[PDB]
Write an enzyme that holds these catalytic residues in place. Structure first.
Site, short mmCIF file in Angstrom:
data_model
loop_
_atom_site.label_atom_id
_atom_site.label_comp_id
_atom_site.label_asym_id
_atom_site.label_seq_id
_atom_site.Cartn_x
_atom_site.Cartn_y
_atom_site.Cartn_z
N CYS A 159 0.81 -1.22 0.00
CA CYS A 159 0.00 0.00 0.00
C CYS A 159 0.85 1.27 0.00
O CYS A 159 0.52 2.24 -0.70
CB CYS A 159 -0.97 0.00 1.19
SG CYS A 159 -0.21 0.22 2.82
N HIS A 219 -2.21 1.14 6.79
CA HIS A 219 -2.74 1.14 5.43
C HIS A 219 -2.98 2.56 4.96
O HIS A 219 -3.43 3.41 5.74
CB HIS A 219 -4.05 0.33 5.35
CG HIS A 219 -4.47 -0.01 3.95
ND1 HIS A 219 -3.76 -0.90 3.16
CD2 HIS A 219 -5.52 0.40 3.21
CE1 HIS A 219 -4.37 -1.03 2.00
NE2 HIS A 219 -5.45 -0.25 2.00
#
Lengths: 150, 146
Positions: B28, B89
């Protein structure tokens, strides 16, 4: 005391719309698909998950958790446990539930690891080319005993 | 001019490996780093947690997911971010309809697997779970990209 988990295929169900599930001799698992424009989801972010214990007859709901991977549901051979892959963002955990009550038996944080569950147990991988655990430079066996609570 | 600079950058960034040997689809932070590099937007270095730490210290935060989508529609880079215990994330928010009337559409790579990846077809509320999606921070850059 190391119980064996088998993958449960989760497929579109007849009847009530947008339901996905599967069953074996012991347990039926159902999810709702609430993504308005995706008829073939790979995951289920919205509880409840419905468990039916075929033997006892009890139906229960897992009211919280997720996101549940569609391809990440496994049943213990005796039907007493449902093992589920759940993720959030880049984090993930494996969670075992009592099929008769829907209560959590065990959690393990597996964030950052590739993983697989099959007849032979749980494998966790590091230094991987891709998502499959077989793409990993090192794969470690991880005990399933706390998940089974046989 | 078109207002597709963010989406074009996401598409162009998907197949790159910001980190040597690590495809962006699986990382990510790397995906977001590639997007920002293409747009020439300065981005904190490091893994997802370190990036969120940096954004928290420097970028304006938006009040809602709804506002994040509007800003993305206006050509601003908007990063949805939430620290993890070790693996945090980050995702790029894009224009689009809100999932459950709250959660904006996004692009992101994810080490969690294909289920955590979005090539614009999942909202942040379908990448992060029911508890985490309500804890998201939406960081917007001070300048628009188109």
């Amino acid at each position: 005391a190391d119980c064996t988990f088998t993958q449960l295929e989760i497929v579109p169900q007849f009847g009530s719309p947008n339901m996905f599930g599967g069953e074996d001799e012991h347990v039926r698992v159902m999810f709702s698909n609430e993504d308005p424009n995706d008829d073939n989801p790979d995951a289920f972010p919205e509880p409840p998950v419905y468990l039916a214990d075929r033997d006892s007859g009890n139906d229960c709901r897992i009211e919280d958790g997720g996101i549940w991977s569609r391809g990440g549901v496994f049943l213990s051979q005796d039907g007493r446990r449902v093992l589920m892959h759940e993720f959030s963002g880049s984090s993930a955990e494996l969670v075992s539930y009592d099929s008769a009550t829907c209560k959590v038996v065990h959690r393990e944080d597996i964030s950052g690891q590739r993983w697989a569950v099959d007849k032979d147990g749980l494998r966790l991988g590091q230094k991987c080319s891709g998502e499959s655990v077989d793409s990993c430079a090192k794969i470690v066996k991880r005990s399933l005993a706390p998940f089974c609570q046989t | 001019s078109h207002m597709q600079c963010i989406v074009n950058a996401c598409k162009n960034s998907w197949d790159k490996s910001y980190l040597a040997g690590t495809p962006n689809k699986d990382n990510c932070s790397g995906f977001v780093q590639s997007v920002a590099a293409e747009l020439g937007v300065p981005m904190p270095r490091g893994n997802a947690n370190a990036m969120v730490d940096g954004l928290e210290q420097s970028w304006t935060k938006l009040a809602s997911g709804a506002e994040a989508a509007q800003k993305a529609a206006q050509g601003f880079l908007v990063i949805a971010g939430l620290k993890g215990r070790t693996y945090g994330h980050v995702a790029v928010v894009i224009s689009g309809p809100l999932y459950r009337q709250k959660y904006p559409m996004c692009w992101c790579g994810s080490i969690a697997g294909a289920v955590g990846q979005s090539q614009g077809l999942k909202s942040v509320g379908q990448v992060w779970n029911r508890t985490d999606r309500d804890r998201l921070n939406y960081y917007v850059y001070s300048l628009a990209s188109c």
